[PDB]
Amino acid sequence: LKSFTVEKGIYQTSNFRVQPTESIVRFPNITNLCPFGEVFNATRFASVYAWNRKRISNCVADYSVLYNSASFSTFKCYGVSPTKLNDLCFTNVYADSFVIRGDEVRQIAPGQTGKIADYNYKLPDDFTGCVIAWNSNNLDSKVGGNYNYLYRLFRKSNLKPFERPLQSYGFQPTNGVGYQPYRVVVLSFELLHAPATVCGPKKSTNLVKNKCVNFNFNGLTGTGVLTESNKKFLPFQQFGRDIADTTDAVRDPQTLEILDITPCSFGGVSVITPGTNTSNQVAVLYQGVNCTEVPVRVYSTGSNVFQTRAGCLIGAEHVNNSYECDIPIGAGICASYQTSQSIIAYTMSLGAENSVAYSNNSIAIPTNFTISVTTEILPVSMTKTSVDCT
Amino acid sequence: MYICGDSTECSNLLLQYGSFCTQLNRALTGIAVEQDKNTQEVFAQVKQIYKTPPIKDFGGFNFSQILPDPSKPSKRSFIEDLLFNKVTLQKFNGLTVLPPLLTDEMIAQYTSALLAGTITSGWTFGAGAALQIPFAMQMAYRFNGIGVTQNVLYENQKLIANQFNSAIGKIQDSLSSTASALGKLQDVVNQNAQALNTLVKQLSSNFGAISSVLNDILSRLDPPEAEVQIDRLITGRLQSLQTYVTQQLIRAAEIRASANLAATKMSECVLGQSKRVDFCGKGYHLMSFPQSAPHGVVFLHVTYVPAQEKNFTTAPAICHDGKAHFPREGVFVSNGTHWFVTQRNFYEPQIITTDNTFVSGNCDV
Amino acid sequence: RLDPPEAEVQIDRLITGRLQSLQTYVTQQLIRAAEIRASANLAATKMSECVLGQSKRVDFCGKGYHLMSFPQSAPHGVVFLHVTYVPAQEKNFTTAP
Amino acid sequence: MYICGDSTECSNLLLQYGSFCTQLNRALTGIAVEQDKNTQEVFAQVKQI
Amino acid sequence: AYTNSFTRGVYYPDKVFRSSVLHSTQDLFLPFFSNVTWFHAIHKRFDNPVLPFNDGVYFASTEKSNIIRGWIFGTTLDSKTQSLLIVNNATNVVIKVCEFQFCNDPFLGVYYHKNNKSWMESEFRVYSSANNCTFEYVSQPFLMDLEGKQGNFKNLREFVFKNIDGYFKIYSKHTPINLVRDLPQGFSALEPLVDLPIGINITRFQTLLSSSGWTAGAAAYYVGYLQPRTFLLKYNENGTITDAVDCALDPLSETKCT
């Protein structure tokens, strides 16, 4: 009110809003998988000279089923991260499957040194494929040594980017650390080049109910209270909307159940007080709010709480007599300062009851009069005002 | 909450616009207080809560259908319940409805007090202490007010009571049958609901932004672009709020005009007889009975209507002995052979005598 | 603080804000003027019907039976002193039509 | 016809603003009906010529 | 000629659930009382042409025993562009997006009781030649009421096919009826069946089924084309559309929509 003294009455103040308690995420376990399991895990790979190139589209690039492996030493992407892949969608993916010398794992990396690399696998200048290092000695090992994966490719002409050494007799487990055969796997994908046809995985968490929480259901983010509902969603229907087109029901992706969404309790806060001179005691009304949520006279406890159709009153004694209205509240409730002294909330009385002595043949006639001079004030005009707009 | 529901960044951006939110809240609070003031002015017009005696010997008039029925949990009369049944018909985004200060039960109590005061003390209770008077005598006073001699009522009391009872029954049947009578209240409710619905629907508009979802904008855009989009959304939603509040202010102004008219009708018809033509109903107003309806009032205007007009031959004065006699009150009428003097609103011929006429001038004028 | 080519954007933002403020103020003034004009019409009617004559309308020129009224000038308004007759002491009697 | 007179692109851009224009049309139609209501109330007081 | 088609033209907007709500939406619908072409599959004469796919198609048939097995979707149909193949057995469909080369008469062709009075499969042209492919999908081995049990015609295989922003969507619903004559009167909504992010994008489509002297075939199917329109749909308690109104059919419907 911008005043050090406030007159008797009830004044609106800062709105009361219930803050969320915890965050809840729900999603399906896992969806269809892109053909990455074979490239990242298989029995036989293609030849080094016949380096494989497979177009991957129309699937879900799920990194959960791919990152569950623990043999990788350092699988991180410079510009992105696997964890945030969940909501990242690809255009097309390319997989390079071949078996080469272990020491050539870095030779496959972009911006390398050595003419033995581009002889079999040229290094493009804009390769976004994140390098991956993993052990495949058992898979690439042969009892006598497999020399079929030779590096005879020695073309003299310069090699264009994607236009299409033999220090060991063969791939044998006897090779020392860093020299055993390794299968180089790189998931090289380009974005904004082909129509979006591949998307990422999702993550799930536990379930809670009957609390103001921030929910994320299949990418639908919101805040509210999740309750068990009797609505019967159709087998395919997921969300539910009200007349005003606002979310009101949601189907849990994990459990085939329907949950009602109710916005967290909120409402205006009014302060009922007599004149500052009369006393500094006040009561607080939370409008249209069950006072099972007011703890979250500003304190958790509500002293003598009093539920009323116009919200919950805190700090006002509930008197069960009737008087004339002093400070209105709502739904026929009025608060006033009375006798030690305290603020009392009661049901307003419309006036003294009267039973006129009406009868067959009884008439009441006055025998005297009074002259009453009563005032009446009416506004007639208000101050003129012109404005220089410019 | 409406503009920036649960968004610290959007709230911070909205802080720059100044006191628009405070102005809108103040306007809505003014309207809300004005509603309670309107109901108070219309209904709370009695210093005391009167009540009719148990013995309903009202000279044959039957007010059962308008008097309260204690049996029902809500002490509302038959017609009041009829109206309540006939009248028939967002929390997410900061929209709240505050209950009225005066509940339906207490409004019904006010109406019952007014009705009991009327039937038991005429119009005295509206001008001072309520003074009892038999309802037959009260109706005689009403007839004298409209200009018909009280002997008319005292001699046609049974017929008048039967006509009033039949009229009450007919109005009850009409209200029970057709719902078009309460179109005014239904339209008020529908307009308010439609305004709120449009306000809520406005939240699903881009206003040129990338999306209508603040959380989506924030998550998918970096500080600067998110700020630009959120500012666009803020402008759109603030325009929506201002439009809604202006419409509400105009509608509240018209509703206040209606409430003032209703209060004037109460004071000038229920609390007394009115000589203003077609103000308390069509015809010569005799009385009015109030009834409470959802978010409004209903007046049952009881009026007197001449029915069976018959012509006669009339003259302005009469020549007796060179002196021009004029009717004191009434008119001179003849059926063709004789001359009589009768009151102007009910054919009651009487012999023309010196006590019915006053002399003035002579014949030749 | 800014080169005009980019300062024009800030100037436009300020102009839009202040113009919206002016429009809101004028709309509020129009509504308030309508309300005050309704009150002034009521006051003129009360003057004509109570000061310039005796009113038979109930509760118009004060509670009780109207006798007269006297006007008094107040800042941006008017004050009426409604004089009224009010019966005081009532006695029951047995009546007959 | 006023804001985006005969322009599909302008109409599509205006569609993003919600039901502002529908509200405006509703208000103007209400005023138009109220005019006839006023005339009827003022003049048509007797239904027998 | 195209025969009468009263409404039979709306499937479902989306997944949302609405109860006792009258919702209006502007999408690709089959206009009410619009003309939908009619075909009779003659078993020399053979009714099986290649029809354009003008942004959505509606196919209604009462055939039994899966006489009309599946659909062919493509823009070249000559292995130059990947094409979709919707041939289905009672077990499951073999949905396949590949640069498949197509023959003039590429279907299984179980010509039973045609010219030999015996059940046999003369050809196997369902696979003409797979020169190159990009993806294939096999649906769950379901068991739908697509087989041959005549009784009284109750297999109204109303199907709606759409392609928007790289998504191919199929909606359908098995509607039992009692009138074996032309499409009877009623109301039914087609729940979605499949959504695919294929991204291939169709200019023409064909249905999959010298018999000189053989009796004329007994099989009929419809082909209607969708247009962009606004519709009003009446969701019931269960969120099932009991009725609908075409917001541009006639002035009364326009007023209802308004």
Ligand SMILES: *[C@@H]1O[C@H](CO)[C@@H](O[C@@H]2O[C@H](CO)[C@@H](O[C@@H]3O[C@H](CO)[C@@H](O)[C@H](O[C@H]4O[C@H](CO)[C@@H](O)[C@H](O)[C@@H]4O)[C@@H]3O)[C@H](O)[C@H]2NC(C)=O)[C@H](O)[C@H]1NC(C)=O
């Ligand atoms: C116009 O109105 C007057 C009012 O009625 C009417 O003149 C006569 O008035 C008297 C009563 O007001 C009527 O009743 C008559 O009363 C007399 C006693 O005064 C009775 O004697 C009458 O009985 C018969 O005998 C009379 C004397 O011989 C007759 O004159 C009379 O007609 C009866 O036959 C009777 O009860 C009376 O009927 C009328 N009329 C007459 C002639 O008295 C006058 O008639 C009205 N004019 C018209 C065209 O109706």
Ligand SMILES: *[C@@H]1O[C@H](CO)[C@@H](O[C@@H]2O[C@H](CO)[C@@H](O[C@@H]3O[C@H](CO[C@H]4O[C@H](CO)[C@@H](O)[C@H](O)[C@@H]4O)[C@@H](O)[C@H](O)[C@@H]3O)[C@H](O)[C@H]2NC(C)=O)[C@H](O)[C@H]1NC(C)=O
């Ligand atoms: C004043 O109130 C009513 C205003 O119309 C008068 O109408 C009376 O109401 C009902 C309607 O028939 C009748 O009964 C009255 O109401 C109930 C129920 O009535 C029962 O009896 C009637 C037969 O009389 C029967 O038809 C009904 O189905 C009920 O079984 C009871 O409280 C009383 O019976 C009461 O009389 C009256 O017949 C009806 N009367 C008339 C003239 O319409 C009512 O008469 C008035 N009350 C008084 C004391 O005058």
Ligand SMILES: *[C@@H]1O[C@H](CO)[C@@H](O[C@@H]2O[C@H](CO)[C@@H](O[C@@H]3O[C@H](CO[C@H]4O[C@H](CO)[C@@H](O)[C@H](O)[C@@H]4O)[C@@H](O)[C@H](O)[C@@H]3O)[C@H](O)[C@H]2NC(C)=O)[C@H](O)[C@H]1NC(C)=O
């Ligand atoms: C002045 O206008 C008033 C209009 O309300 C008249 O009051 C009512 O008018 C009707 C129409 O005549 C009167 O009906 C009565 O009918 C009887 C004949 O039938 C009556 O009796 C049977 C039983 O035997 C009963 O079932 C019927 O319903 C009738 O009640 C005539 O003999 C009467 O004269 C009279 O016409 C009503 O009686 C009358 N009162 C009510 C409550 O309706 C009024 O009659 C006119 N004044 C006159 C003509 O002097």
Ligand SMILES: *[C@@H]1O[C@H](CO[C@@H]2O[C@@H](C)[C@@H](O)[C@@H](O)[C@@H]2O)[C@@H](O[C@@H]2O[C@H](CO)[C@@H](O[C@@H]3O[C@H](CO)[C@@H](O)[C@H](O)[C@@H]3O)[C@H](O)[C@H]2NC(C)=O)[C@H](O)[C@H]1NC(C)=O
């Ligand atoms: C009463 O008012 C006049 C006058 O009637 C006479 O008035 C006095 C001068 C004395 O002589 C009285 O004794 C007498 O009643 C009547 O005006 C005319 O009345 C006739 C009916 O009687 C009207 O005709 C009626 O309506 C049409 C047109 O005539 C036809 O269907 C019939 O002819 C029917 O009778 C006539 O129109 C009317 N003159 C006009 C309108 O210019 C009056 O009718 C009578 N009123 C009543 C009984 O209600």
Ligand SMILES: *[C@@H]1O[C@H](CO)[C@@H](O[C@@H]2O[C@H](CO)[C@@H](O[C@@H]3O[C@H](CO)[C@@H](O)[C@H](O)[C@@H]3O)[C@H](O)[C@H]2NC(C)=O)[C@H](O)[C@H]1NC(C)=O
């Ligand atoms: C996602 O992962 C969880 C964990 O496995 C799956 O949850 C539940 O998995 C079991 C299958 O073993 C389903 O059967 C259930 O068995 C329990 C007894 O252990 C029984 O009490 C349940 O009534 C039910 O029959 C169970 O339905 C399933 N719960 C859910 C919500 O699915 C889950 O299946 C995986 N997928 C999804 C969509 O949740």
Ligand SMILES: *[C@@H]1O[C@H](CO[C@@H]2O[C@@H](C)[C@@H](O)[C@@H](O)[C@@H]2O)[C@@H](O[C@@H]2O[C@H](CO)[C@@H](O)[C@H](O)[C@H]2NC(C)=O)[C@H](O)[C@H]1NC(C)=O
């Ligand atoms: C006048 O009216 C009522 C009742 O009438 C009188 O009752 C006796 C006391 C006596 O005065 C008789 O001559 C009258 O008939 C008096 O008080 C009311 O009485 C009725 C029941 O009898 C009761 O229902 C009311 O509640 C009483 N009070 C009222 C109507 O206000 C009353 O005292 C008498 N005197 C005056 C000045 O009113």
Ligand SMILES: *[C@@H]1O[C@H](CO)[C@@H](O[C@@H]2O[C@H](CO)[C@@H](O)[C@H](O)[C@H]2NC(C)=O)[C@H](O)[C@H]1NC(C)=O
């Ligand atoms: C305010 O909240 C309390 C508790 O929610 C209500 O009391 C009931 O308590 C039981 C606990 O078993 C709940 O199951 C009920 O839901 C509660 N009833 C209701 C109506 O909520 C209390 O009644 C609520 N008060 C109002 C006015 O709604």
Ligand SMILES: *[C@@H]1O[C@H](CO)[C@@H](O[C@@H]2O[C@H](CO)[C@@H](O)[C@H](O)[C@H]2NC(C)=O)[C@H](O)[C@H]1NC(C)=O
């Ligand atoms: C329907 O019956 C036929 C009988 O051959 C089968 O269809 C093919 O069966 C082979 C063998 O499994 C599959 O490779 C094909 O994909 C099937 N589809 C064809 C020919 O279009 C099968 O028994 C049933 N069709 C199925 C399972 O798709």
Ligand SMILES: *[C@@H]1O[C@H](CO)[C@@H](O[C@@H]2O[C@H](CO)[C@@H](O)[C@H](O)[C@H]2NC(C)=O)[C@H](O)[C@H]1NC(C)=O
């Ligand atoms: C939704 O559909 C169900 C159908 O079961 C309705 O619930 C009732 O279930 C009983 C089971 O015997 C049926 O006999 C009734 O026909 C169903 N009632 C109705 C009106 O269909 C339910 O009422 C429908 N609406 C809901 C659940 O909100």
Ligand SMILES: *[C@@H]1O[C@H](CO)[C@@H](O)[C@H](O)[C@H]1NC(C)=O
């Ligand atoms: C599958 O790949 C992961 C990581 O590349 C690895 O942990 C695992 O050893 C591989 N399995 C086999 C049989 O190579």
Ligand SMILES: *[C@@H]1O[C@H](CO)[C@@H](O)[C@H](O)[C@H]1NC(C)=O
């Ligand atoms: C104190 O406040 C009350 C409010 O009603 C007022 O009646 C009273 O005059 C005030 N007294 C002083 C000394 O301010």
Ligand SMILES: *[C@@H]1O[C@H](CO)[C@@H](O)[C@H](O)[C@H]1NC(C)=O
């Ligand atoms: C509260 O209401 C009950 C009603 O039975 C009553 O017994 C009690 O006296 C009331 N308390 C007060 C302080 O009036």
Ligand SMILES: *[C@@H]1O[C@H](CO)[C@@H](O)[C@H](O)[C@H]1NC(C)=O
């Ligand atoms: C649409 O179907 C009716 C049915 O006979 C036909 O008369 C009409 O010609 C058809 N529309 C056109 C453009 O042919």
Ligand SMILES: *[C@@H]1O[C@H](CO)[C@@H](O)[C@H](O)[C@H]1NC(C)=O
């Ligand atoms: C009989 O069977 C063969 C293949 O089995 C088929 O090609 C032919 O159409 C059928 N009718 C004949 C040969 O007349």
Ligand SMILES: *[C@@H]1O[C@H](CO)[C@@H](O)[C@H](O)[C@H]1NC(C)=O
């Ligand atoms: C098939 O088509 C794709 C894209 O046109 C191409 O990358 C691939 O090499 C082709 N494969 C064969 C076997 O033709």
Ligand SMILES: *[C@@H]1O[C@H](CO)[C@@H](O)[C@H](O)[C@H]1NC(C)=O
């Ligand atoms: C079909 O062909 C066009 C030509 O560019 C292609 O761009 C478009 O993606 C296609 N339509 C769809 C949904 O793919």
